[PDB]
Amino acid sequence: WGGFSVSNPTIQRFFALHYLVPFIIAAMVIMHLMALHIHGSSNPLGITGNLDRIP
Amino acid sequence: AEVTQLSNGIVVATEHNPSAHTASVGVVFGSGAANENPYNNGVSNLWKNIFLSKENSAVAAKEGLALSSNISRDFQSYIVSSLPGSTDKSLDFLNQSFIQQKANLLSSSNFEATKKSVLKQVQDFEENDHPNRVLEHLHSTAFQNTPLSLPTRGTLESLENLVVADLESFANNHFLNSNAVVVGTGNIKHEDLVNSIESKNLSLQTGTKPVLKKKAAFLGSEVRLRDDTLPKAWISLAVEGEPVNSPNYFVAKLAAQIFGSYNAFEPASRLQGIKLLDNIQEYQLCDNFNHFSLSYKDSGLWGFSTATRNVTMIDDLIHFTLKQWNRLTISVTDTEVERAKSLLKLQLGQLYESGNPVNDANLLGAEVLIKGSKLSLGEAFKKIDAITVKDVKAWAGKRLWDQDIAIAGTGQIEGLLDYMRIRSDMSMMRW
Ligand code: HEM
Numbered sequence: 001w002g003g004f005s006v007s008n009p010t011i012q013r014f015f016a017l018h019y020l021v022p023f024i025i026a027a028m029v030i031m032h033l034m035a036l037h038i039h040g041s042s043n044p045l046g047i048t049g050n051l052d053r054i055p
Numbered sequence: 056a057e058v059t060q061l062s063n064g065i066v067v068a069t070e071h072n073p074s075a076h077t078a079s080v081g082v083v084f085g086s087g088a089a090n091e092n093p094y095n096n097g098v099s100n101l102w103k104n105i106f107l108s109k110e111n112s113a114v115a116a117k118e119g120l121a122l123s124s125n126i127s128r129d130f131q132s133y134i135v136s137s138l139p140g141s142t143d144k145s146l147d148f149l150n151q152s153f154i155q156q157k158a159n160l161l162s163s164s165n166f167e168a169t170k171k172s173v174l175k176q177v178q179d180f181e182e183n184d185h186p187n188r189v190l191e192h193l194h195s196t197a198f199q200n201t202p203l204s205l206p207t208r209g210t211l212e213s214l215e216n217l218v219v220a221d222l223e224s225f226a227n228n229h230f231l232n233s234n235a236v237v238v239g240t241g242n243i244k245h246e247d248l249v250n251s252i253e254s255k256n257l258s259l260q261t262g263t264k265p266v267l268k269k270k271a272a273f274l275g276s277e278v279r280l281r282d283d284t285l286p287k288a289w290i291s292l293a294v295e296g297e298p299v300n301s302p303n304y305f306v307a308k309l310a311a312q313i314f315g316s317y318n319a320f321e322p323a324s325r326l327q328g329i330k331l332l333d334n335i336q337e338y339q340l341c342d343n344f345n346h347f348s349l350s351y352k353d354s355g356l357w358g359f360s361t362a363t364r365n366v367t368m369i370d371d372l373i374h375f376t377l378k379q380w381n382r383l384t385i386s387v388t389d390t391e392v393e394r395a396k397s398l399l400k401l402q403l404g405q406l407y408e409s410g411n412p413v414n415d416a417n418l419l420g421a422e423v424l425i426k427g428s429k430l431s432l433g434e435a436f437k438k439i440d441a442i443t444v445k446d447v448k449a450w451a452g453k454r455l456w457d458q459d460i461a462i463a464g465t466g467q468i469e470g471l472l473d474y475m476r477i478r479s480d481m482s483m484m485r486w
């Protein structure tokens with residue numbers, strides 16, 4: 001809180017953190033894509049897709 | 056160096072050469088593999104081998120006579136060779152054993168022995184000759200459901216159900232005086248050949264061959280024959296081209312000569328003035344390629360064929376080659392045109408002035424069957440020297456720029472991308 005209740009110090013700190021966390025989500029989205037590039041995507045049948053690929 | 060044609064109901068063409076040591080005499084017909092149907096495909100290839108069987112070649116060898124034959128899509132040939140003072144014996148053999156009597160050749164024992172050897176020829180071709188079977192597959196996807204699609208050797212399945220009746224039917228319909236040309240090359244004079252023919256009478260059959268229902272049509276498509284156990288990838292790619300007796304016949308040949316042919320292992324072939332070579336040699340994406348411009352009575356093909364061991368960079372090879380083609384519409388220079396002029400003259404100057412009279416006879420008979428006359432080599436050169444940059448750009452803007460393609464491939468072709476990413480490379484976007 002920064003005090004004894006939800007007050008002015010609470011609302012000013014919640015806005016500065018609210019601007020920040022979107023840029024942390026973006027950095028986790030890049031790490032998410034790196035882990036997909038290793039094995040690529042799956043498919044609705046649940047078997048290998050290395051025999052027929054499209055760019 | 057001039058040919059002479061006469062007609063008596065029988066056309067007789069001749070290119071006399073007094074300084075040769077042999078003479079060739081034969082008959083050429085105007086029906087090929089594009090004059091048969093999917094049921095009797097290969098009947099012409101089986102006619103060639105009945106002509107070249109043992110007991111007919113033995114009878115010719117006792118007299119000092121050699122035999123030859125050839126099957127193509129528009130024509131067939133049956134040729135006899137001899138020493139220059141033995142040409143009347145050549146005509147007699149061609150009369151007796153071929154046009155008049157053939158019950159000797161179509162016997163029950165000679166037919167089975169011939170069929171066994173031809174089946175082994177075709178089976179061997181389909182398992183070991185990879186550059187040539189991919190070009191045959193290109194013809195079959197480009198012209199599918201049309202007479203110019205059928206292979207010249209025949210197919211192993213259609214070739215098994217043939218009988219002697221199929222041969223006799225095909226002979227009665229296509230081996231006819233209206234569909235025939237009698238040729239003579241080497242040391243043979245026109246008057247002597249004319250005199251020897253009228254001393255006999257020499258007619259095969261009358262005429263009225265069948266008309267072909269369907270006309271040839273090009274269709275953009277692909278066929279992939281994947282085999283991961285072979286050590287290379289073989290690919291051929293083309294567009295629709297020019298037929299014989301077209302105004303753009305020599306301009307399409309000059310354009311193929313601009314990009315030419317390549318062998319990576321020959322040192323002098325790496326030094327040719329071809330701008331495509333500046334792109335391939337740095338990573339060595341191929342072993343060889345060759346550009347072709349094929350022409351028939353109804354249509355044609357223009358393109359290239361290649362073989363490579365670098366199976367992870369196929370997409371770079373196709374991409375760089377198709378971008379060079381785009382320059383024929385936009386930015387082809389004058390130096391590239393003057394080079395291809397003089398190398399095209401050397402090419403067809405060696406094809407039409409070799410020393411073999413057998414090749415002369417096949418060329419002469421095929422040209423006279425279509426045009427009624429042969430264009431001399433001094434005339435063809437003048438047409439080639441009159442081509443300009445504007446003629447090339449006008450031809451390419453109509454035949455190459457954003458046009459459909461046909462593709463065939465075999466071997467390790469995982470790296471060959473889909474149709475529409477290759478089709479998109481036929482235009483630039485940056486013009
Ligand atoms: C900002 C949020 C996210 C973004 C931008 C994102 C992006 C992507 C993209 C572009 C793909 C490519 C394949 C596809 O579209 O299915 C993908 C796949 C995948 N994502 Fe996400 N993702 C996000 C959140 C999540 C979440 C919340 C989960 C699970 C809790 C998740 C799990 C997966 C999985 C398992 C795949 C692979 C599916 C497959 O290949 O079958 N992602 N993601």
Ligand SMILES: CCCCCCCCCCCCCCC(=O)OCCCOP(=O)(O)OC[C@@H](O)COP(=O)(O)OCCCOC(C)=O
Nearest residue numbers: 025026027028029030031032033034035036037038039040
């Ligand atoms: C033991 C002693 C240690 C003491 C020292 C303490 C220091 C500790 C921290 C060290 C610093 C971190 C190491 C540096 C590092 O990993 O990144 C810097 C290198 C460049 O980053 P990158 O991962 O190559 O780019 C990241 C790339 O490789 C991945 O690309 P991707 O984002 O997956 O592609 C998506 C783009 C698609 O394009 C679009 C968006 O359309």
